[PDB]
Enzyme design. Structure first.
Site, PDB file in Angstrom:
ATOM      1  N   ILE B  13       0.825  -1.194   0.000  1.00 51.24           N
ATOM      2  CA  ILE B  13       0.000   0.000   0.000  1.00 51.24           C
ATOM      3  C   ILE B  13       0.866   1.254   0.000  1.00 51.24           C
ATOM      4  CG2 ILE B  13      -0.209   0.288   2.485  1.00 51.24           C
ATOM      5  CD1 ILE B  13      -3.032   0.673   0.072  1.00 51.24           C
ATOM      6  N   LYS B  42      13.117  -2.705  -5.102  1.00 46.78           N
ATOM      7  CA  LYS B  42      12.973  -1.479  -4.325  1.00 46.78           C
ATOM      8  C   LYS B  42      13.806  -0.351  -4.909  1.00 46.78           C
ATOM      9  CE  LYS B  42      11.825  -3.700  -0.057  1.00 46.78           C
ATOM     10  NZ  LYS B  42      11.521  -3.017   1.193  1.00 46.78           N
ATOM     11  N   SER B  82       5.102  -2.456   7.361  1.00 45.91           N
ATOM     12  CA  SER B  82       4.604  -3.810   7.169  1.00 45.91           C
ATOM     13  C   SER B  82       3.863  -4.304   8.412  1.00 45.91           C
ATOM     14  CB  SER B  82       5.775  -4.738   6.868  1.00 45.91           C
ATOM     15  OG  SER B  82       6.501  -4.997   8.067  1.00 45.91           O
ATOM     16  N   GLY B  83       2.957  -5.260   8.216  1.00 46.96           N
ATOM     17  CA  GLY B  83       2.198  -5.813   9.335  1.00 46.96           C
ATOM     18  C   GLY B  83       1.403  -7.090   9.095  1.00 46.96           C
ATOM     19  N   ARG B  87       4.124 -11.945   5.175  1.00 42.05           N
ATOM     20  CA  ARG B  87       5.112 -11.077   4.547  1.00 42.05           C
ATOM     21  C   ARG B  87       6.126 -10.623   5.587  1.00 42.05           C
ATOM     22  NH1 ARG B  87       3.393  -8.673  -0.261  1.00 42.05           N
ATOM     23  NH2 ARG B  87       4.563  -6.775   0.172  1.00 42.05           N
ATOM     24  N   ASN B  90       6.198  -5.726  11.315  1.00 45.22           N
ATOM     25  CA  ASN B  90       7.137  -4.880  12.035  1.00 45.22           C
ATOM     26  C   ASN B  90       6.488  -3.574  12.445  1.00 45.22           C
ATOM     27  OD1 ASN B  90       9.315  -6.700  11.931  1.00 45.22           O
ATOM     28  ND2 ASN B  90       9.806  -6.064   9.855  1.00 45.22           N
ATOM     29  N   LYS B 136      -0.421  -2.047  16.902  1.00 35.74           N
ATOM     30  CA  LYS B 136      -0.922  -0.772  16.402  1.00 35.74           C
ATOM     31  C   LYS B 136      -1.497   0.073  17.521  1.00 35.74           C
ATOM     32  CE  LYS B 136      -1.829  -2.424  11.738  1.00 35.74           C
ATOM     33  NZ  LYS B 136      -2.775  -2.694  10.629  1.00 35.74           N
ATOM     34  N   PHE B 158      -8.471  -4.878   1.729  1.00 43.39           N
ATOM     35  CA  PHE B 158      -7.780  -4.692   0.468  1.00 43.39           C
ATOM     36  C   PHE B 158      -8.417  -5.603  -0.559  1.00 43.39           C
ATOM     37  CE2 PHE B 158      -3.364  -3.177   2.120  1.00 43.39           C
ATOM     38  CZ  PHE B 158      -3.988  -2.164   2.817  1.00 43.39           C
ATOM     39  N   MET B 169      -8.630 -18.203   0.694  1.00 48.37           N
ATOM     40  CA  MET B 169      -7.311 -17.980   1.255  1.00 48.37           C
ATOM     41  C   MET B 169      -6.246 -18.700   0.438  1.00 48.37           C
ATOM     42  SD  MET B 169      -8.108 -18.406   5.396  1.00 48.37           S
ATOM     43  CE  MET B 169      -6.612 -17.552   5.833  1.00 48.37           C
TER      44      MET B 169
HETATM   45  N1  LIG Z   1      -7.101  -5.874   3.808  1.00 52.82           N
HETATM   46  C1  LIG Z   1      -6.459  -4.983   4.731  1.00 52.82           C
HETATM   47  O1  LIG Z   1      -7.025  -4.213   5.442  1.00 52.82           O
HETATM   48  C2  LIG Z   1      -4.938  -5.074   4.728  1.00 52.82           C
HETATM   49  C3  LIG Z   1      -4.220  -4.256   5.730  1.00 52.82           C
HETATM   50  N2  LIG Z   1      -2.826  -4.244   5.728  1.00 52.82           N
HETATM   51  C4  LIG Z   1      -2.106  -3.305   6.549  1.00 52.82           C
HETATM   52  O2  LIG Z   1      -1.405  -2.249   5.607  1.00 52.82           O
HETATM   53  C5  LIG Z   1      -0.280  -1.855   6.195  1.00 52.82           C
HETATM   54  C6  LIG Z   1       0.936  -2.044   5.220  1.00 52.82           C
HETATM   55  O3  LIG Z   1       0.914  -3.406   5.007  1.00 52.82           O
HETATM   56  P1  LIG Z   1       1.702  -3.877   3.611  1.00 52.82           P
HETATM   57  O4  LIG Z   1       1.429  -2.875   2.498  1.00 52.82           O
HETATM   58  O5  LIG Z   1       1.373  -5.332   3.219  1.00 52.82           O
HETATM   59  O6  LIG Z   1       3.256  -3.778   4.127  1.00 52.82           O
HETATM   60  P2  LIG Z   1       4.565  -4.485   3.476  1.00 52.82           P
HETATM   61  O7  LIG Z   1       4.752  -5.862   4.043  1.00 52.82           O
HETATM   62  O8  LIG Z   1       4.513  -4.494   2.025  1.00 52.82           O
HETATM   63  O9  LIG Z   1       5.881  -3.583   3.858  1.00 52.82           O
HETATM   64  C7  LIG Z   1       5.716  -2.197   3.816  1.00 52.82           C
HETATM   65  C8  LIG Z   1       7.072  -1.524   4.251  1.00 52.82           C
HETATM   66  O10 LIG Z   1       7.391  -1.755   5.505  1.00 52.82           O
HETATM   67  C9  LIG Z   1       8.953  -1.369   5.531  1.00 52.82           C
HETATM   68  N3  LIG Z   1       9.575  -2.309   6.420  1.00 52.82           N
HETATM   69  C10 LIG Z   1       9.440  -3.631   6.595  1.00 52.82           C
HETATM   70  N4  LIG Z   1      10.263  -4.009   7.583  1.00 52.82           N
HETATM   71  C11 LIG Z   1      10.881  -2.873   7.975  1.00 52.82           C
HETATM   72  C12 LIG Z   1      11.824  -2.732   8.944  1.00 52.82           C
HETATM   73  N5  LIG Z   1      12.391  -3.729   9.841  1.00 52.82           N
HETATM   74  N6  LIG Z   1      12.360  -1.573   9.238  1.00 52.82           N
HETATM   75  C13 LIG Z   1      11.939  -0.477   8.502  1.00 52.82           C
HETATM   76  N7  LIG Z   1      10.984  -0.610   7.520  1.00 52.82           N
HETATM   77  C14 LIG Z   1      10.477  -1.824   7.273  1.00 52.82           C
HETATM   78  C15 LIG Z   1       9.429  -1.515   4.326  1.00 52.82           C
HETATM   79  O11 LIG Z   1       9.681  -0.136   3.906  1.00 52.82           O
HETATM   80  P3  LIG Z   1      10.753   0.195   2.714  1.00 52.82           P
HETATM   81  O12 LIG Z   1       9.861   0.214   1.508  1.00 52.82           O
HETATM   82  O13 LIG Z   1      11.346   1.554   2.965  1.00 52.82           O
HETATM   83  O14 LIG Z   1      11.916  -0.760   2.477  1.00 52.82           O
HETATM   84  C16 LIG Z   1       8.267  -2.103   3.498  1.00 52.82           C
HETATM   85  O15 LIG Z   1       8.393  -1.631   2.228  1.00 52.82           O
HETATM   86  C17 LIG Z   1      -0.111  -2.773   7.436  1.00 52.82           C
HETATM   87  O16 LIG Z   1      -0.561  -2.350   8.670  1.00 52.82           O
HETATM   88  C18 LIG Z   1      -1.080  -3.875   7.139  1.00 52.82           C
HETATM   89  O17 LIG Z   1      -1.357  -4.330   8.520  1.00 52.82           O
HETATM   90  C19 LIG Z   1      -2.096  -5.163   4.919  1.00 52.82           C
HETATM   91  C20 LIG Z   1      -2.732  -6.297   4.114  1.00 52.82           C
HETATM   92  C21 LIG Z   1      -4.276  -6.220   3.948  1.00 52.82           C
HETATM   93  C1  LIG Z   2      -8.786  -6.225   6.881  1.00 56.31           C
HETATM   94  O1  LIG Z   2      -7.856  -5.790   7.868  1.00 56.31           O
HETATM   95  C2  LIG Z   2      -6.694  -6.547   7.847  1.00 56.31           C
HETATM   96  C3  LIG Z   2      -6.499  -7.583   6.976  1.00 56.31           C
HETATM   97  C4  LIG Z   2      -5.346  -8.330   6.958  1.00 56.31           C
HETATM   98  C5  LIG Z   2      -5.525  -9.252   5.975  1.00 56.31           C
HETATM   99  O2  LIG Z   2      -5.512 -10.618   6.444  1.00 56.31           O
HETATM  100  C6  LIG Z   2      -4.372 -10.931   7.023  1.00 56.31           C
HETATM  101  C7  LIG Z   2      -3.970 -10.566   5.507  1.00 56.31           C
HETATM  102  C8  LIG Z   2      -4.223  -8.991   5.110  1.00 56.31           C
HETATM  103  C9  LIG Z   2      -3.709  -9.571   3.841  1.00 56.31           C
HETATM  104  O3  LIG Z   2      -3.451 -10.929   3.837  1.00 56.31           O
HETATM  105  C10 LIG Z   2      -4.629 -11.460   4.243  1.00 56.31           C
HETATM  106  C11 LIG Z   2      -4.401 -12.822   4.185  1.00 56.31           C
HETATM  107  C12 LIG Z   2      -3.905 -13.683   5.160  1.00 56.31           C
HETATM  108  C13 LIG Z   2      -3.813 -15.061   4.888  1.00 56.31           C
HETATM  109  C14 LIG Z   2      -4.254 -15.599   3.674  1.00 56.31           C
HETATM  110  O4  LIG Z   2      -4.191 -16.932   3.360  1.00 56.31           O
HETATM  111  C15 LIG Z   2      -4.770 -14.752   2.697  1.00 56.31           C
HETATM  112  O5  LIG Z   2      -5.191 -15.328   1.504  1.00 56.31           O
HETATM  113  C16 LIG Z   2      -5.694 -14.342   0.595  1.00 56.31           C
HETATM  114  C17 LIG Z   2      -4.849 -13.386   2.988  1.00 56.31           C
HETATM  115  C18 LIG Z   2      -4.268  -8.006   7.826  1.00 56.31           C
HETATM  116  C19 LIG Z   2      -4.504  -6.889   8.729  1.00 56.31           C
HETATM  117  C20 LIG Z   2      -5.697  -6.193   8.721  1.00 56.31           C
HETATM  118  O6  LIG Z   2      -5.926  -5.171   9.559  1.00 56.31           O
END
Ligand SMILES: NC(=O)C1=CN([C@@H]2O[C@H](COP(=O)(O)OP(=O)(O)OC[C@H]3O[C@@H](n4cnc5c(N)ncnc54)[C@H](OP(=O)(O)O)[C@@H]3O)[C@@H](O)[C@H]2O)C=CC1
Ligand SMILES: COc1cc([C@@H]2OC[C@@H]3[C@H]2CO[C@H]3c2ccc(O)c(OC)c2)ccc1O
Ligand SMILES: NC(=O)C1=CN([C@@H]2O[C@H](COP(=O)(O)OP(=O)(O)OC[C@H]3O[C@@H](n4cnc5c(N)ncnc54)[C@H](OP(=O)(O)O)[C@@H]3O)[C@@H](O)[C@H]2O)C=CC1
Ligand SMILES: COc1cc([C@@H]2OC[C@@H]3[C@H]2CO[C@H]3c2ccc(O)c(OC)c2)ccc1O
Lengths: 309, 309
Positions: B13, B42, B82-83, B87, B90, B136, B158, B169
């Protein structure tokens, strides 16, 4: 009009080959393997290939008949299979695709994952880095043993790995203040923007002059020594870098104690910058990309480096 | 004129937030960390950001003053740390960024890495997936303990991870013949195209109406049950899918025997699809993105899914 299947479509050079193929006007197909499950970046790459007009073709290297069907849809197959130890190194997996092509019998030409040092010429190379050349030769021999018409694209360092960093191994950005020069720095190396390598690939795959041939990517303005490339950077920045000359004996010191992937990188660099394998032999204009395709206006190393300023 | 620093610029994102900030006309700065020197993807994102007009700022989370100097240059900081367990997870690394923002004193607003379920409502959540909401909330408490102005963007799945796979999944594509449906499939879920999430983010970070607020991304047309989601795909394809319902007890069975990133995913799905945590509460129009920014023509799930055809 020419139908082309790209295998390794979401790889580094592969995704560019895909785009270059679409831009050249090839009806373009890409192998979407089903084993890429949660690899969101690959999926979305495929999604964007389709938006630009690529055709998804589902297949798997664990399903010999899927490879057969896939290649039955096209006139040309281009393979960009992985082949770098610090990423992954599965050149030999192509063997399954070769035999799929064999059984299918329709493929007018096959381009295996070469795009680098010329394998037939690295017979003296040192392990582990040598595993690359041997595996590609293994695939070359399977291609020719099955009579598959072929084109091998060889010759140029990827600019991102060897130019943008002034050929330093630790990184992919230019150095701030200090740089290492390998030996005297007077060994010619061939650099090419990866978009150009892809562009040449797309123009050659149905060029009759490259049928059953090795095509070299040696664009004259980009044949530069490492001191010459470092000097382009010093010009662009108006700043001189502290240069340390590194002798072969020092560049290889204690290689035995290093992790296998790094040993292989060190070996590749050794051949390029100390033995000069990319410029130690001559090639005519009927087998060099920039002469076969002069309308390609290949990016020079100074404009490539300008992106980093 | 608003100067934003995106931390996490190359994340999933995060890179979308970078480009949305640019398209919105913010003067956009991205943190490029020196640890990512050999990750080609990157490095070349940073180049592509540069070409779009982003400003590169060098800093490391291992160099407190680099962070301070980073955040001194901007009015607004967006973290996309990241979170996700399969993946990288952190979230807590942001605490150092919060410390820097505190010491620097100039930051007019901070957007921490939220973008999902609303953590303060996940009190009773199942471990290990609970880790996401507790970390968080620990970050939230440092932001407010430090008196840093905030905006929390929450509330939407997402689309790539929950819609393009019909909520299946461990895959990211629509199933070909059979789909699993959690429960009856009549629990309302919230789906958003991740580009709409980034666009709302870029629009809210200089909006007075959302200073120190939670902002829900709940676009009314994308409030769907899983069956409605599945029925959209069925109308696009013209093929009915064979539906198997799965009761809560069977979805959660033997969870403790799962790879703990899959435990986290299972728990998250359970809260979304079985308990309806994204729709079990109402939100006013003064705290919901599509209502705050009606000029954004957000992508509906039928337009989203047309890409997978
Ligand atoms: N459906 C939903 O609602 C979803 C919600 N989320 C949430 O979106 C947010 C971003 O998630 P996502 O886009 O998957 O994140 P990513 O796993 O893609 O990582 C995002 C960035 O985190 C930085 N990073 C990772 N490790 C470190 C570290 N040790 N030290 C410093 N920077 C670090 C990196 O920055 P750099 O680019 O500078 O190297 C990386 O590019 C999260 O809170 C996630 O919980 C995510 C998946 C689905
Ligand atoms: C919707 O809000 C969130 C969603 C996630 C979603 O589920 C955990 C993740 C993020 C993206 O990855 C979803 C996922 C987890 C395990 C799976 O097998 C999967 O298959 C699509 C998808 C993480 C944090 C959030 O706050
Ligand atoms: N300076 C130079 O001249 C360089 C030359 N090269 C050469 O370029 C060629 C491609 O290199 P590169 O672009 O990095 O390779 P990548 O690491 O980028 O991999 C490319 C593709 O290989 C496919 N792949 C990987 N493993 C498997 C597997 N087990 N089974 C099936 N498919 C697999 C994947 O295809 P999929 O998309 O289907 O997932 C992947 O996308 C190689 O020969 C390499 O030696 C590369 C580096 C520099
Ligand atoms: C030029 O020919 C080749 C280039 C390579 C590219 O040099 C081996 C690789 C590779 C790119 O990744 C290079 C490399 C290996 C180890 C490193 O530390 C490295 O740092 C930039 C770069 C791969 C196979 C080749 O035949």
């Amino acid at each position: 009009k020419t139908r082309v299947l790209v295998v390794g479509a979401t790889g580094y050079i592969g995704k560019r080959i895909v785009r270059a193929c679409l831009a050249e006007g090839h009806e373009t197909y890409v192998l979407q393997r089903p084993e890429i499950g949660l690899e969101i970046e690959k999926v979305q790459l495929f999604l964007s290939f389709k938006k630009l007009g690529a055709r998804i073709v589902e297949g798997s290297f664990s399903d010999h008949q899927s490879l057969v069907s896939a290649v039955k849809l096209v006139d040309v197959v281009v393979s960009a299979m992985s082949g770098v130890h610090f990423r992954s190194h599965n050149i030999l997996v192509q063997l399954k695709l070769v035999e799929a092509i064999k059984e299918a019998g329709n493929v007018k030409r096959f381009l295996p994952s070469e795009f680098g040092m010329d394998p037939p010429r690295m017979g003296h190379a040192l392990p582990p880095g040598r595993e690359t050349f041997d595996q590609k030769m293994e695939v070359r021999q399977a291609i020719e043993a099955a009579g598959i018409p072929y084109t091998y694209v060889v010759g140029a360092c990827f600019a991102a790995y060897f130019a943008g960093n002034l050929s330093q191994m630790v990184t992919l950005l230019p150095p701030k203040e200090k740089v290492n020069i390998y030996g005297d720095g007077n060994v010619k190396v061939v650099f090419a923007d990866e978009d150009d390598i892809a562009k040449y690939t797309a123009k050659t795959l149905n060029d009759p002059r490259t049928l059953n041939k090795t095509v070299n990517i040696r664009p004259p303005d980009n044949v530069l020594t490492q001191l010459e490339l470092v000097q382009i950077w010093e010009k662009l920045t108006g700043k001189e870098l502290e240069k340390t000359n590194i002798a072969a004996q020092d560049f290889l010191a204690n290689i035995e104690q290093m992790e296998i992937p790094h040993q292989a990188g060190i070996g590749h660099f050794y051949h390029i910058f100390y033995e000069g394998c990319l410029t130690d032999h001559e090639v005519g204009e009927d087998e060099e990309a920039s002469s076969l395709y002069p309308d390609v206006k290949y990016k020079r190393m100074d404009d490539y480096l300008r992106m980093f300023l």
